[PDB]
Symmetry: D2
């Protein structure tokens, strides 16, 4: 029972399980160097995120170079080599105010504010007529519609809508500077999914051979397909992860999920748009549907922010990170903790520890029996493999895959046993980190002419990796998923093999 | 139908429908001890008022208790709408405390700065940036060089650099604003203070005379600590519930024996974080809540709930998330501290707590709780309790109505955690107040005189329970309720279950 | 724990220590009419006395009923040990029978030629040449190659000439022909003139149930119901399914009836042998689902008509009927006219008790609990059976007036016996139709205080349960009652220790 | 969903669309001896031919075996439609019989007298008074008042006196005392000198299985095993449970046997009639639990010896045996000496097929599943799980000894198990297992292993399509090894039907 699982949790016993959730780290000035990156990889970093909200293409190109230099420095031993994915995080559409002749002119709880659109009234914002770059703001806003300014600092409330201006009352005021960020809860923002700057960044991402794109501010399915279109044919194999940052994204989550390769839950941005007594519900909902759909869900923002200045996180942060894992998140993303903080290596190590500790609180058998309660030969084989992995108490499930799909298919049923995905495709090896329980392995050996010899070679390689990682030892039993004939593109073959 | 589907169907646009089942415990202080404000807190959902005996005199607390009962009984004219309010005494216990600053504000401690700790009573009111006084006289022989000292709920951490015969020289590791009379923790040290001091005895006796409903025993490290508290309360306070506060590592280590000796448990997450690493505290919380749920004893989550509401009218998303997960872990009650005691928005804190708790109810997967609690569990009264919860799921009952004198039979039903609310009908004002400790129990106080005929008296109390249920929106005409009683008057045990239609 | 393991743990060397739960119905005749024999049959386990109204006058049957009640009430001195005995009237129905033979037995020789006359000039001079049967419109509904059966399907004939007057056949096979023997044609009135008289005689004699023969549709049951009328509205109607049409329209027959009797012997005449076991399983299944009694009859222990012990095939066939979910087993000639009626009853008791060891109770309930269609009484019924398993209770005690509440508990098939306590003598007798109900007749006067009267009846059930060995001091039992005097619900459940 | 719903859904006007999963064993005698008749019995559904060595000479049985094989191989020209037919040897065992009748039959009426003699001069003349039997030790195991049954329990006797070389009895139950009839007494050796010779003959005739009569204990089975020896080590030994001791010591017998035959008739004489059904259900359950074949025999369709159709009760008796969980049903006199041997086989086929509709397949499996680190066992379970999950038309198992097909069969999948083998003996022996449909592959071994696997699988595909098990578009489960000549059948493949 799940209750008994909680009762025998022991804080004095070390985590005997391996970490199954991926760790995504934002690379910046504090972690940009090869030497630091090497230690972060050793500490458990699986994906390197590039925040294109700031920095030039030159800067980021150097960062990508350093990440790959640090990564390939472990290639001298393919058994212990861990693939590292590169993630591009788009800037996305913003709503910014004008320049207060910078400086600030405070407001107060009661006064009025006449929002404008005069494209020359930029350089001088008062405590009355305020400017913003959102041209079509007057047809997606209503009367009574709140307008948060500077990350949920100053809330307004529309009173009069002309045709290209708004009269507002200041709900709660304070300091207000230049080029601040405004949020419109819960309006349907009509800004383009792909800014002209995003089109540049995404183009750059294709040339840099990035593995995935974190698309900011996704509100609908058509936004995702717009990013897809920009990536085009050349970037068709790049995984698109939609970032849910506002109320519309939550409401239209199903169409966004069906259009995406994965989901990022941005709690911080969510907390600005919707009340605090509901954000946890939205998180648990979105994670649940991603798990049900077998698509990767990333939990981001406000993970270990205190570790920017401290070597140790608060227990609240540790509890929040742990509960995200227990919710069913596939990956956890660090931001300023690794980008600009004083302890980037400690943050990665702490995230590893918390993820490992939360593993003990996971009730593996229940999740599978529910995901099974919810035709195709590959689906039956995947279910059969997981079922067999519980029956034999297997040390691992070895999946021979080209694109990664066969491994993802097994991963969606959440077996206790780690999934060793063996591939010769370096990209799918890197992209596999997005899925919980998948331990990607990159085979470098040339193809054998005899198909059964090539399979046996890939299996034995996985066998060696498993022994080295301590997943299993000789005498144990593993489940092996392959195809049947040379280049028949569907995994329908399950094999229960003793560990040699 | 499945836990996964249950999570998938969660909707933030949908208004929270079902009632709030977890208790709300509020610490009363300068910001909330007036009759006027107390009335608003009760309206907003306060079930239990906590008296913090770490501060204040007996006449101070007697006034608070009087104000609570005045505010509570102001609603007593309408027994259908009347909500019982419990009074909790939180003992001081083996505390170590600073340390009065000058002549009423604070000083700033900066990183890497030298700070001297003294035991010289000539400095007990002249503490500052350089010298600091505390009341633990044996501190120099329980602490070593390199020992960590935490001040004011772990806000400030110090490291001992030099051991003097009567003093300590420290270096500030974590800076901050030190105030007056703040708590001190010595994680690795073995503090010599007793579980029940002479001051605590005076306080517990005061609690008996003031007819408090429960005692929150601070810093419980073992079973014998609970037996001491139980002993002081004696025969006169034999019905006062004892809640043991787990605040350190030894308390977690010896949790099983403390739980068996106690009536309930309070998990102090904040104090726990001092001795236990951040990557392990959440495990400890889930463990203790689980064993409490298993034993059928109330568990309270306290400290670090809505602390930001001390200065802001709205909590952070992280706080609301942390509160909700405590409820989802299986906590029976949530306790508020500085939010209601001294903060600027005590009314807003209680309302937000009610709002978070109610929203969290939507994420609770009720049937699995019961199905597991029935399979892995250790009596006609017990079989009746299980059967009643069974029927409540089977019939989709609006409520389980339990006619109880001591509250026991209602507690036994609560252990199995039905989805339907448990309306405990009692004529005992004390068990009505104590019932708030248990999740899903909605205590109701019948003041009607005992009817001559027993069956007539039962129907009277059931009719009272159904009126309450209708008024609270638990059920309506045409619904079905489960009723638990004994057989014949003066019956020893509740072994009778009835399925009755709502007229 | 599982069904398979339950079968694996079966032990023929261990005494059947469970109580017999299936009702025993005995056909009373010249071999069992006497008060002495009836007394012993009651002691041996007879629950219901069946009177076959296909033969005998009302004078004869009134005497048989009187003897049954004399034997039954001879045990009334001890209310704790008194077992109620029901009386069943079995109608003749639309029977087609032959005529008497001149002198008397003749042999219908295999391959011969018979002539079915409809003229009353050969009704007393039948032989191997010309045969008479009491059916008129036989030449209005038949082809020239059909089959006709004699002596309960024993002899078979092949019609090869028609017209209107007679029928010319050929003996495919046969044996012996007595006189006025059963004839089968694989639209007589459902309730004939004679049936109406017998049914009204049944109301006058205060019989507990009626076994309606040859029910083919729901309107047949309604007609029987109509004849019984207001005076006999509480009399149970058990519809006998004896042909193919009864099987096809079984659903409407079941809904209209109070119970069902599966006549396997007659069923085999029309339906192929390879199909009858399926029909039996289907009908018993739908009866259990609907919560209505199903009786298995005919071809039970027929060998015991002349022998003191049955064959193993008969024991297996009876046991399987019980294991199929039958509520009652009916004996015919074994008790009516046979040389060992007392041994037949005892053997029936023996087999039914041994078969209980193979009953897997939990699965029956779990499936019924999941299949069953806000009623306080129905919810209490489920909860009581569920609590009986959980507490391993020795019995479920049900205080009932009409028997309905006890019937609702019986539907869920608890392993524990259901002690139905009643003051109504008829409900006590009719309760035997339901598997697992041990009816008990309280004769103590009504106490002034309702609660005290409930305690008295429960206490009476306690004493019966102890004397029967259902439970003992210290055990736990479930008790189902109403809440106040004149309650329309049996919605109150108690878990009470045995005093 | 529920067994109850499954029963309520039974419909007698709906034709049995499913195939017969239970094996049919037929006793061959003077009525079914000919090649022509045997051909019709094979087409009607006979899977196993039983030879009763209680009667007849070796050469008589040698000709029967030749005829059975001539009839079976007449269908060999079509590998896809060809059905393997097993040969079973049923030993005489420790049985005691009566002598010859002077005349011929004499009449023994209830309430008479009878002289049971050891006079060898009266083993030719056993009339109304005198009768001869071949058990010399008869006056050492029978008391005064002991009961004696003759000819399958037809006639019973009461011992009043105990003479020297004879007995004085009292006819308790009447009947017609025929000749060479069997006699029951509710110390003859487990295997006799005759049995030793008969078992040797069985090894020489290459029979597939031995029905060992009157097995009482484990040491009886191993005595038979030892006689069969090295040369007959692959011959299946099925122990016949015919008395109380066999039932009491059933576990040790089952653990020593390859299979079990439940002889209800012989059980009925020894054990009370109100207990035999319990014994039958217990033994079948334990065999199912152990994954060992159980045969229900005796008193099946006896009325079909003289009639073209069975009675209602016999149809219910056979059907309930199938529903009890019996792997095979055996016919005796109905096929051996009766007037309607062909009709007996066809009726047995019809009843077995009709009973199939009453089986809730998922219930048996879910119980057996929870009632291993061994890869072959895990693969076997997984294959059955997949067959339910995919609603597979069949489970194709490539097997050499049959062992792999057997462990899949233990879990009782709804889908037929197509056992593909090149070993003709395992093809014949596979008939003992419920749900196994054996096929004999005759294509020569291909050089490349993956090619030879595909050849065997495609053969199973064509058999399945010809039999109507499945059609193009459906999905089947396939169990194989991984490399040429391997120890474990540990490979499971979910493959579409071309
Ligand atoms: K960004
Ligand atoms: K305190
Ligand atoms: K009749
Ligand atoms: K034999």
């Amino acid at each position: 029972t799940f209750l008994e699982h909680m009762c025998r949790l022991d804080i004095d016993s070390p985590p005997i399980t391996a970490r199954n959730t991926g760790i995504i780290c934002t690379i910046g000035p504090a972690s940009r160097s090869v030497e630091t990156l090497k230690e972060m990889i050793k500490s458990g970093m699986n994906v390197a995120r590039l925040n294109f909200s700031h920095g030039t293409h030159e800067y980021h190109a150097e960062t990508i170079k350093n990440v790959r230099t640090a990564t390939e420095s472990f290639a001298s031993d393919p058994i212990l080599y861990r693939p590292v994915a590169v993630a591009l995080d788009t800037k996305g559409p913003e709503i910014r105010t004008g320049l207060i002749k910078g400086a600030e002119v405070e407001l107060k709880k009661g006064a009025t504010l006449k929002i404008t659109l005069d494209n020359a009234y930029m350089e001088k914002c008062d405590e009355n007529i305020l400017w913003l770059d959102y041209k079509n703001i007057c047809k997606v806003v209503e009367v009574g519609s709140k307008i948060y300014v500077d990350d949920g600092l100053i809330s307004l409330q529309v009173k009069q809508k002309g045709a290209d201006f708004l009269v507002t009352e200041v709900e709660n005021g304070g300091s207000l500077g230049s080029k601040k960020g405004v949020n419109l809860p819960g309006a349907a923002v009509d800004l383009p999914a792909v800014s002209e700057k995003d089109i540049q960044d995404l183009k750059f991402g294709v040339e840099q051979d990035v593995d995935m794109v974190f698309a900011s501010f996704i509100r609908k399915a058509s936004d995702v397909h717009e990013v897809r279109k920009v990536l085009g044919e050349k970037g068709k194999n790049i995984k698109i992860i939609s970032k849910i940052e506002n109320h519309e994204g939550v409401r239209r989550f199903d169409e966004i999920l069906e259009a995406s390769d994965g989901i990022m839950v941005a709690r911080g941005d969510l907390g600005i748009e919707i009340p605090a007594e509901k954000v946890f519900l939205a998180q648990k909902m979105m994670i649940g549907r991603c798990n049900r759909a077998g698509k990767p869900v990333i939990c981001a923002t406000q993970m270990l922010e205190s570790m920017i200045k401290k070597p140790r996180p608060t227990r609240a942060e540790g509890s929040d990170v742990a509960n995200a894992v227990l919710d069913g998140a596939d990956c956890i993303m660090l931001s300023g903790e690794t980008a600009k903080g004083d302890y980037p290596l400690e943050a990665v190590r702490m995230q590893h520890l918390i993820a490992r500790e939360a593993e003990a609180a996971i009730y593996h058998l229940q999740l599978f029996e529910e995901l099974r309660r919810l035709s195709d030969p590959t689906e039956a084989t995947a279910v059969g493999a997981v079922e067999a992995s519980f029956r034999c108490c297997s040390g691992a499930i070895i999946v021979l895959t080209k694109s990664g799909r066969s491994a993802h298919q097994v991963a969606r049923y959440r077996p206790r046993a780690p999934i060793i995905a063996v591939t010769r495709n370096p990209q799918t090896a890197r992209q596999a980190h997005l899925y919980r329980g998948i331990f990607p392995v990159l085979c470098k050996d040339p193809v054998q002419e005899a198909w059964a010899e090539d399979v046996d070679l890939r299996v034995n390689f996985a066998m060696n990796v498993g022994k080295a990682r301590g997943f299993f030892k000789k005498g144990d039993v593993v489940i092996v998923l392959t195809g049947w004939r040379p280049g028949s593109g569907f995994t329908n073959t399950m094999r229960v093999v003793p560990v040699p």
